[PDB]
Symmetry: C5
Subunit: 362 residues, 5 copies
């Protein structure tokens, strides 16, 4: 256990088999749930104190909520004694996701007044996936009408487009964004016996054409239908997120590219004890751009069962953030990026996107 580490990689990977989260994961759930008013999952109301205190930019809140929700879904699978709590937190997550503070950028930017409108898949992909995970975890049909509506809408946009997929916002196509939307269709299908996921094959064929560099195992940053343009930089954070979710739908896809991804972006250092991830090609700098390459690669390592890389990345990410546990609750004095506690929480618990799809009922 190096300084600034709270539990072993062996312990994180064993949680599901031990049917128990680690004490530091429990302490993160406490940060999430414990203190009146200021904890993020205190209330279903449209209050965002936790996010104001962390200085989360408004455009990032929707992602904070989503990534917490994805971690909570794995908490439910890990420990049956925590499943009701996870379900409660997911209920709040969905409820908060619907507040104008979360989606309102859509209106402030002049795109429209309803966030469910065409082509806002940034928001509505995550929301749809969250609707599905909430239902898988709890059995509650509270959001089932909305879930069915949003699923139909997403499917209809896919059907209507000459390219395979949907734009994340107007004329901007991102593979990560799509991966969420498609994964939400798999979740709906699991709940309802439908075949919305049929579209997945065409999408996976398409993203393997101009959107990926197959030698390097890396996706380009974005695609823009109106002009045909593919932005000419490859992106590690983009690729890590996309491969992780894709591995739940078509495991062979991600298994093909994962080793090349690592050759391309991952720098191992400190005599093999640590790793950090370059955000693009043609640089030695780690964690450029949005600063999330290492954190999303941590999730990916977990999704691929790569314990060595997980340990290396977490040795780089966690200690400088200066974790402490005060009154059985986890705080980081110096988080190194946006979405920091969210992504470390997620990666520590992540049971695999395929396992979430196959979650036994309650």
């Amino acid at each position: 256990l190096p300084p600034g580490r709270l539990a072993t990689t062996e312990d994180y990977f064993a949680q599901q088999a031990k049917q128990a989260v680690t004490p530091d994961v429990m302490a993160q759930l406490a940060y999430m749930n414990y203190i009146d008013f200021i904890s993020p999952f205190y209330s279903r109301g449209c209050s965002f104190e936790a996010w104001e205190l962390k200085h989360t930019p408004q455009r990032v809140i929707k992602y904070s909520i989503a990534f917490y929700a994805y971690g909570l879904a794995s908490v439910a699978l890990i420990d049956p004694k925590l499943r009701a709590l996870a379900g409660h937190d997911l209920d709040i997550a969905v409820s908060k996701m619907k507040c104008k503070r979360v989606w309102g950028d859509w209106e402030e930017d002049g795109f429209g007044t309803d966030p469910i409108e065409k082509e806002n898949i940034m928001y509505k992909g995550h929301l749809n996936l969250m609707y599905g995970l909430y239902q898988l975890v709890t059995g509650s049909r509270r959001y089932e009408a909305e879930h069915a509506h949003l699923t139909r809408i997403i499917h209809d946009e896919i059907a209507a487009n000459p390219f395979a997929g949907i734009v994340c916002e107007p004329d901007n196509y991102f593979v990560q964004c799509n991966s969420v939307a498609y994964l939400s269709l798999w979740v709906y299908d699991r709940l309802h016996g439908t075949d919305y996921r049929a579209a997945t094959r065409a999408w996976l064929d398409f993203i393997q054409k101009d959107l990926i560099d197959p030698e390097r195992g890396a996706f380009y940053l974005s695609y823009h239908p109106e002009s045909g343009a593919v932005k000419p930089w490859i992106s590690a954070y983009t690729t890590a997120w996309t491969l992780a979710m894709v591995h739940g739908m078509d495991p062979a896809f991600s298994e093909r590219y994962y080793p090349r991804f690592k050759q391309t972006f991952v720098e191992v250092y400190d005599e093999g004890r640590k790793a950090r991830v370059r955000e693009t090609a043609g640089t030695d700098d780690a964690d450029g751009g949005v600063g999330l390459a290492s954190a999303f690669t941590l999730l990916l390592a977990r999704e691929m069962g790569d314990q060595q890389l997980f340990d290396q990345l977490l040795n780089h990410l966690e200690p400088p953030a200066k974790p402490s546990i005060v009154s059985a609750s986890l705080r980081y004095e110096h988080p190194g990026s946006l979405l920091f506690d969210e992504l470390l929480f997620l990666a520590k618990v992540h049971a695999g996107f395929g396992a979430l799809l196959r979650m036994p009922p309650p």
Copy 2:
């Protein structure tokens, strides 16, 4: 010891107030802070002005509690010293009036829950308001708020009757035992004033919170319960337990007597060769006063409610001296309050006559 530095009066003096029919000079000085200076004192005006709270930096969500806990302390002041009863009644009138201002309840609307704070399931607000209505009337005899009191009491009772679980949610899908304890205690107060039996629901509630929401070995309640999912948050909470046991002791003394010693074994750290004490907020930590930071302060109230002079003295030796009290121009100020609701809770604990004694308050 007897008077350590940073202490203003002995525990023996606080406990003797009711028998001496007089508050201590420091309690008088706290009433001065509350009443003296034009505009900026908290109980200066019935209007919707909150300067005292702005100056203390009270967060808006906490104002309702500040007002309530001041009111509970005022109710005991009335019992202590008949010469101060009219003043207490005046301050309670102002308390109730301020409680009704949008600055106090408006979070309900800002959060998107609704436009009327008396609506279903806002018992965080309306529990305290109902209890205050009742205490105002017990202290003064005034029927000024009787109509509103009857209405709010009927509403609360109806929500209890309608729920499959025993009790009411503090806000949607969040059930807190402390919150319920206030609501139920308000029903006892209404019944005292009017001969009704709204308090009949108490037995079912006490059975429910015991079967399910307490760890009986540790003498501690879990943090919250959430009906839609069935979830009980898996941490025990000292502040939650201290507040709940204190109010419960006024309705069913045996309940609190059963758990109080275990509560102390679980949460209370005695230190400094028995002279001091501080309270851990949850299990599995050595840190004192985590979470909302009110474990010690609510335990101080509990100790007073249970007649535990030793623990009271220990807690107050921990809480009061670091806050650096001073009396300037016969008025009490704390240079370094250690928590939210600091002067409110210390005031309350210093005067608290017992929730049962408030129920049995003689008329004026």
Copy 3:
């Protein structure tokens, strides 16, 4: 003349006999009238730059204007060459008093939309007294209709109440507040031959029951009719203000209590050269509470002809405030309280409230 003093006490007390204000009082009038835009009596408009620059809290502005006006009424008596100027300033005073910035707390607090409504005697006592003093000084009937209306309203509230007097705001009765209101009735009577002042005897009998401690010569802070409560602290600032105004209506009342008041509250120090006033009993601290005990005692000493105490108090109050005269205008670098230049101005010129009532016409 100690350092930080501008004229002798003998000079202040001699102004009326010399028919001239002191140069420092002239310099205060200059502060009040000279500089474009920023002087307080520059304009009848609803502009409050002078008060913004002094940092006057909004609740205090109504008192600032009133106390300036009371000093101006004495300026008019002192020096016939300045009476037109004083009258002009009083006109502006009355006009500014009617602006929403001054009275608008009544609305912000939720009490009502019209400040003349029942039970806002904090505002309407001072306004009614000002209306009267304006007319005594000038002979103008500009405000006579409003004056008659407000006088009738105040009289009706007194008649309607089971206790003698009116509340300053709902359920809060203050003797100072009443003293202003009753003094406004004396002024109306002087201008119109009416007997609104008949109510005074009942009020003076009442305030001498629970409201005063007759041994200590001090009023309690406030009275609250709904509950019957009298706040159990005595207040120097309250008593000093009330005795001063009462001395204009019933001189014997104030003569009875004045010496006891001084025993109770006034601390003489610095080998008899200085004095300061304790705000309540059971403390050695001076000028606690609102911080106006010494300043109102200065006014009281002037009202009672107590030259020694006046000199002592002013030796305490003025020098630390660091007066200077620049371009024949008076500035205090370090005013020690709210209402600082207002109350020192007033006390320096105050001819006695009785003398104001007996002001010869123009």
Copy 4:
């Protein structure tokens, strides 16, 4: 010789009209006024005030900043025929900016009314009317002629209606400076149109010489207030300097009578006769009290009266401490000593006399 911290000699400023050229430092001030995109004050006719935001001009002062610039521009036109078109362009902008709510809106914010042309807002409308006139004298353009005729008629009607001679600057506040502007605007209208609105001048000059002036001291009292009859009992140098300067264009003998007394009363010569500064009122040794503009308006007055010695003295006091620099042929002051600082120094440097503006040859 050039005294320390000065940009040009007094002899050079006074010679501009005869040389038919402004001095280089005046050119540099015109550059500050006109050169840089967006932030120069005379860049745009739009309701943008960046130049004033950068200088920290209080909003109540903007109307005066614009007016005093315009008066200087009118003299630039007379000085150098090659700059007359530019001056006329700047005056067009001046008038246009003067009509923006940012400039006049205090009238509304103070609760007096919603229209600044109303009644009794002669602080604003005096200057506006004078500017309308000067714009037309400089350019020949009839762009604002309708508005000019309307505002002139209004001003004349208020004078006719008042029992006292003149108009109040705002309600119940009468200021002689304010009136001087209004009356001067009537002379300008009469010059353009052959009318006799100026007939009211004599009655006004007789009136201001009664309670409003101390004739021994050559100084006006601060203000007069009709409703009460009050005259504020302090004399004011800035008030007097401004009033005498404008009055000299209508009745030169009036200002010649009082000017020497004014100087005895207020002007302190110091530094072995090289410098001067002006006391704002009586009974003080302090210079430039009150609004802080006594010296600056006296500088204008000295120029109006041909008093080269006093001009030189005042400018030796005013300019060097303000630390002028010329960067990229444009003038900035690092430490302006008062409000309206660059405006009044500009004006005084170019001022051809208010009478000379009235008799400006056409283009």
Copy 5:
């Protein structure tokens, strides 16, 4: 390669022939496109985070967008592999140009509510040129209706004016402004076979009368039709911009004046290694006024094939701005003027305005 320089002048000038941008130009395109939310060309929405982070004043945003767009048009010509990206960025440029944040000064100033009105050529000149360049680069007819409308409007204002050209805003005529508007007509003509550019000869004859000093090779600052005034100062930034654009329409015009311009304004220093430009006559100070003389002269040097001057100017401009390349993206720690990264970007890639007109189709 001096310190603070990223590539040689020989390398910038060779880009078109090598069919590749320099690595530092790639890094600038990364700053423009890479990071989610905060990059300037991330989104077509009305969000201006990139400009908020750079502290761009609102009145300058329209020019920032325009000058970026002009550089993008040359990127398209340089590297066919980047042409789709450039087209995408131009689409966004146009879309952002239409947001009220960009044009709203027109309304705030009281001129009107529609920025296409009459006489707002500062905005609509650039918008029209951008419409054209977008279509040249992409072949997309997305804006063709608006382009045709705006071109007609501009042409109609030229036809209606007694002087040759249009005012940039009411009564303010600027030659730079006109040069943009006229160049937009050439672009429209190239796309549609029309002859809107016929008006150019009259305009070029007119600007050579009072508007230029032909000995000094320099334009006066502005012209004002209502009064006939020409502001009597010459301006280097004005002249550099105008001559650069004019060289695309009538090369001989700019060839005539360019050497005189350099004599008048350009100071070579540091033993010939550097140059800086005076903004007006009668000063030794460089980069006065708006502070853009050197930057626009850098563009002009590029337009005229003057490699020596380009190298000299860039040795003055770039090193003090402290460029760094972090994660393959270009940032300047200390930009020396407004529009700094925009104008250096433009000048580094600029292929010539004539070459843009003759851009081969896609």
